[PDB]
Write a protein that binds this ligand. Sequence first.
Ligand SMILES: Cc1cc2nc3c(=O)[nH]c(=O)nc-3n(C[C@H](O)[C@H](O)[C@H](O)COP(=O)(O)OP(=O)(O)OC[C@H]3O[C@@H](n4cnc5c(N)ncnc54)[C@H](O)[C@@H]3O)c2cc1C
Ligand SMILES: Cc1cc2nc3c(=O)[nH]c(=O)nc-3n(C[C@H](O)[C@H](O)[C@H](O)COP(=O)(O)OP(=O)(O)OC[C@H]3O[C@@H](n4cnc5c(N)ncnc54)[C@H](O)[C@@H]3O)c2cc1C
Ligand SMILES: CNS(=O)(=O)c1ccc2cccc(CCNC(C)=O)c2c1
Ligand SMILES: CNS(=O)(=O)c1ccc2cccc(CCNC(C)=O)c2c1
Ligand SMILES: [Zn+2]
Ligand SMILES: [Zn+2]
Lengths: 229, 228
Amino acid sequence: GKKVLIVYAHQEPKSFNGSLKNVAVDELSRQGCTVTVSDLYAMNFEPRATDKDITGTLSNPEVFNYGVETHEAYKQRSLASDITDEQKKVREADLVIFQFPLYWFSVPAILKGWMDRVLCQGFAFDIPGFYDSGLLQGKLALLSVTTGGTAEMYTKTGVNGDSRYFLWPLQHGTLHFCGFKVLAPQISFAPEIASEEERKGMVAAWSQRLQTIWKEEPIPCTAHWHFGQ
Amino acid sequence: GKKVLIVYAHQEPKSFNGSLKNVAVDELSRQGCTVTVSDLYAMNFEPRATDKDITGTLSNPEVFNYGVETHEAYKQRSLASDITDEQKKVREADLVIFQFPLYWFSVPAILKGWMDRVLCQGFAFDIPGFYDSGLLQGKLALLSVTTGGTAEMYTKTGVNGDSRYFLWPLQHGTLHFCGFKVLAPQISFAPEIASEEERKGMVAAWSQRLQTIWKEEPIPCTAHWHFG
Ligand SMILES: Cc1cc2nc3c(=O)[nH]c(=O)nc-3n(C[C@H](O)[C@H](O)[C@H](O)COP(=O)(O)OP(=O)(O)OC[C@H]3O[C@@H](n4cnc5c(N)ncnc54)[C@H](O)[C@@H]3O)c2cc1C
Ligand SMILES: Cc1cc2nc3c(=O)[nH]c(=O)nc-3n(C[C@H](O)[C@H](O)[C@H](O)COP(=O)(O)OP(=O)(O)OC[C@H]3O[C@@H](n4cnc5c(N)ncnc54)[C@H](O)[C@@H]3O)c2cc1C
Ligand SMILES: CNS(=O)(=O)c1ccc2cccc(CCNC(C)=O)c2c1
Ligand SMILES: CNS(=O)(=O)c1ccc2cccc(CCNC(C)=O)c2c1
Ligand SMILES: [Zn+2]
Ligand SMILES: [Zn+2]
């Protein structure tokens, strides 16, 4: 038995992202997995890191330091509840899938705020206690990304450079940092430009990949994997 | 004369980021420059890309596509005023400085939201008009970043790898894409563990650099500069 959390960042249920999220729910549910979706836009998820995220006495109420205050709020249990709700889903999950359209070579801000606010010190990492010693060790994570640009544009030579370049702050800087083993990204290139048939193909490929997800090895999440040479 | 926009993303006025923003204001103001600050947290700036970003009736109210609807709204002058207030500051600016602490090897989400919502199609980029022909061509941009991690941790075989690796999505995928010339980043490593004196030193060097900012050449914003 496995638990999966899909952190989903798209405004439109009818989108190609919505379809990728739905096929993931359908296929994982079919296998008998436990499935949870955090539909960030539907939740009106708060993306800003503010003093509203701590409800207790501040450690230093004259100079606000978000990192310090949320680490302390975590240990004390005075974090805002929207944060702790997400931490419970993550804590219980064996696999976390992030489903989102690429926005400026990165995640939409609403999903960036989920990372900023949910993956706090004490919960996701400590100092020391990061990368291979991250607190979410033993967990899997997978970025399922859609793009405006074609596969060709995301090669080394390559108007945008290699797709793996923009994956670094996310796969390595965030997921590996917190101790996840990172599965290979699912990148569904340029659905807006693609045929009906090619879109159906991309959706079907994701579905079919999920059938055997539990048998995959993670990627070696390193500079060499991301940048080569 | 010149106009400078500082897009500033820190919750605390007494912070090191706050000091760097303040020094930038003081020095560019001293030079006679026109200076504007967008203090994102104090403005409670909306980070989410939503259908509220378009006023009046939508181009396609059946299936919402953020990119298409904001492109059409830009052309038809139907964007939410917070977005158009920012676009005006950017349009008039000669130089845009982003002042922010590194969050997950990127910008804090409030600032990511500024990028998502302000740099819309038709305003910042188009087909064509991206990278070198981006619609903001001729403007300068500069990332002024603070870090938790020491300079050593940001070497190609330090714990975090090379600084330039995380610079890529911001400098190239965003700033260069919109047509900005990118000046070299100002990176203030690990102010929290630095001495009182090293801090004052980092603040001063920023101020010093700003004295000759208009003499600078933009980096070659290439794959080679970042990774090779
Ligand atoms: C602020 C912003 C920044 C961006 N930055 C970047 C960037 O840096 N790099 C980049 O490459 N792109 C960028 N983009 C483009 C963006 O990544 C794409 O627009 C997005 O990935 C497309 O995904 P979608 O779900 O919205 O597509 P959709 O428009 O929803 O889908 C495309 C088509 O597929 C159809 N569809 C939906 N479900 C199915 C299905 N089950 N079977 C067949 N067809 C289906 C839809 O009807 C639609 O016609 C950016 C966009 C924005 C708005
Ligand atoms: C969600 C999140 C994600 C993060 N991700 C990363 C990451 O990926 N990589 C990374 O390296 N770090 C990361 N960090 C750490 C973060 O980048 C640092 O905490 C931040 O950059 C420090 O800058 P500051 O302005 O907040 O420092 P401050 O704590 O505000 O300043 C440090 C000290 O300088 C003092 N000071 C202020 N002004 C002056 C002045 N004029 N002269 C002398 N002293 C002064 C202050 O009083 C304080 O004592 C993350 C933090 C958070 C909260
Ligand atoms: C190099 N081209 S790309 O398709 O890999 C690409 C890169 C960055 C982008 C940033 C914002 C939006 C878009 C959507 C499409 N824009 C246009 C030009 O109509 C982007 C597309
Ligand atoms: C230890 N390595 S690091 O300094 O390069 C680094 C890397 C990623 C981080 C992600 C979230 C938080 C922090 C610590 C920052 N806390 C405060 C007080 O603001 C990080 C520190
Ligand atoms: Zn890694
Ligand atoms: Zn570039």
